[PDB]
Amino acid sequence: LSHVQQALAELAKPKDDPTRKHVCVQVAPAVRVAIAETLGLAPGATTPKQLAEGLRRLGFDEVFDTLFGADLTIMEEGSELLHRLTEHLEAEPLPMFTSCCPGWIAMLEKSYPDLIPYVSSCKSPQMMLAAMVKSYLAEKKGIAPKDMVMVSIMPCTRKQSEADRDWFCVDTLRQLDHVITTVELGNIFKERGINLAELPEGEWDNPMGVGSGAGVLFGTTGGVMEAALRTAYELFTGTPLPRLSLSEVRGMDGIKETNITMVPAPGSKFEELLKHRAAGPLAWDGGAGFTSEDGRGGITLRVAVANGLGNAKKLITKMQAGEAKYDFVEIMACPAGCVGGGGQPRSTDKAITQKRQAALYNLDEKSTLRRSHENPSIRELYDTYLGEPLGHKAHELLHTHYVAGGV
Ligand code: SF4
Ligand SMILES: [Cl-]
């Protein structure tokens, strides 16, 4: 039985069936924008809440937004980056690589096992949300994890392999049981005569198990990498980080970069560290610093983004050669990123991924910058359950490790 079949079988049990499990779903933004295409419509032609209604009609007990999981990843990865920076300023190495793309993680383990220590220990948004629901939410609702099935809808054909990593288990209890792609889900709806464009607005569930809505605030973060950078930057400097604009790197396909200059906040420990101490296949060059005549030092964070895997191999070679100098690097296996993932609908439109990206968020939400640490649902989870980012409980549920040679 395929994972689609297993999931549908669980949903086929009447809710009052004594062998019926609690079945929940989480949905990626890239799925939400592309699912309209499965009906021959434009990206974003169906609303987030129409999709939530559609999923509920399949028999899902809870319907979650993967963006809640991404708030968790931003919390942990922003903290991890800042921690690595602090340790390096006072003399888990740098540069740091993101860890959300399983295509990258597979290549890392098989082809670059020596780079393992440089990779973020964070789990992906979907795996963080799944770990959370089978632990925190299970406890809150008085439901045994064994009686819980979680499904995720992803634009990606590699997300099941991510979910299947052996140790992503609960206390064979899987944190995330089944991954379904955008097109597979689109097919499920069409086969059941569900037309998403004709559905009423439904509603999301909060993974916290109380209140209404998806448990994510209004607005956009700019994505996990930018938001992790913002978390670190704003704590370091005491000043806001605007939306980033990445620029194409000359002579290297699929690579974009930005340099972020950071002056420590006055009176901060960061200011102290820079002053008090002025003096590995990828050796950190001690970082790119700057100073002024009066002694106001700063560091420039050198950030790169690679799409996709061939292009990433060429970046790594340059990095190892010392020809490319970066402090924080995001590698995505797909040329267009997740909106162009292998589980997405096929279009004759060469610019379909541009249309999908543009429709990801409305102009209203686009104009409002969201910060994960300000989300009351996230605050409550840390305050009452997780403890501190990077802490013992957070590490146990939300972090992971890598296996040289692969799994
Ligand atoms: S970039 Fe592609 S392979 Fe990587 S997580 Fe996104 S959809 Fe999956
Ligand atoms: Cl994810």
Does 25 map to a domain?
yes
Q: DSSP label at 122?
A: B
CATH number of the structural domain spanning residue 171 = 3.40.50.1780
Helix (H) or strand (E) holding 87: helix 67-89
Which among 118, 121, 123 is positioned nearest to 162, based on CA atoms? 123
Q: Identify residue 363 by its one-letter amino acid code.
A: L
Technique used by the depositors: X-ray
Does 311 map to a domain?
yes
Ligand 1 atom 8, closest CA: 156
Q: Distance between CA atoms of 125 and 245, rounded to whole angstroms?
A: 23
DSSP structure string for 275-308:
HH-----S---S-EEE--TT---EEEEEEEEEES
Q: Is there a single domain that holds both residue 182 and residue 234?
A: no
Q: Which ligand is nearest to the CA of 124?
A: 2
Alpha helix ranges (H) inside 340-391? 352-358, 363-366, 376-381
Does 10 map to a domain?
yes
Q: Is there a single domain that holds both residue 323 and residue 344?
A: no
Q: Is there a single domain that holds both residue 176 and residue 315?
A: no
Does 137 map to a domain?
yes
Ligand 1 center from residue 71 Cα (angstroms) = 18
Does 209 map to a domain?
no
Q: Is there a single domain that holds both residue 58 and residue 187?
A: yes
Instruction: Say how many C-beta atoms besides its own lie within 10 A of residue 341's C-beta.
Output: 26
Q: Is there a single domain that holds both residue 240 and residue 324?
A: yes
Are 30 and 344 in contact by the 8 Å Cβ rule? The answer is yes
Are 207 and 133 in contact by the 8 Å Cβ rule? The answer is yes
Q: Distance between CA atoms of 113 and 117, rounded to whole angstroms?
A: 9
Q: Is there a single domain that holds both residue 228 and residue 347?
A: no
Q: Is there a single domain that holds both residue 13 and residue 146?
A: yes
Resolution (A): 2.0
Q: Which ligand is nearest to the CA of 122?
A: 2
Is 100 annotated in a binding site? The answer is: no
Which among 234, 224, 222, 294 is positioned nearest to 262, based on CA atoms? 234
Ligand 1 center from residue 117 Cα (angstroms) = 22
Q: Is there a single domain that holds both residue 283 and residue 140?
A: no
Q: Is there a single domain that holds both residue 301 and residue 387?
A: yes
Which among 182, 240, 222 is positioned nearest to 4, based on CA atoms? 182
Total domains in the chain come to: 2
Measured CA to CA in angstroms, residue 258 lies from 128, 249, 304, 335, 401 at distances of 28, 9, 7, 19, 28
Q: Is there a single domain that holds both residue 364 and residue 237?
A: no
Burial class (CB in 10 A: 0-12, 13-18, 19+), 256: middle
Does 114 map to a domain?
yes
Measured in degrees and rounded to the nearest 5, phi and psi for residue 371 equal -120, 125
Does 214 map to a domain?
no
Q: Is there a single domain that holds both residue 20 and residue 58?
A: yes
> What is the number of H-type helices and E-type strands within the chain?
16, 10
Which among 219, 209, 203 is positioned nearest to 48, based on CA atoms? 203
Ligand 1 center from residue 330 Cα (angstroms) = 12
Are 206 and 375 in contact by the 8 Å Cβ rule? The answer is no
Domain containing residue 226 = 67-123+219-335+369-400
CATH number of the structural domain spanning residue 262 = 3.40.950.10
Does 266 map to a domain?
yes
Q: Distance between CA atoms of 130 and 103, rounded to whole angstroms?
A: 20
- Contact residues of ligand 1, CB 6 A cut-off: 101-103, 155-156, 158, 332-334, 337-338, 341
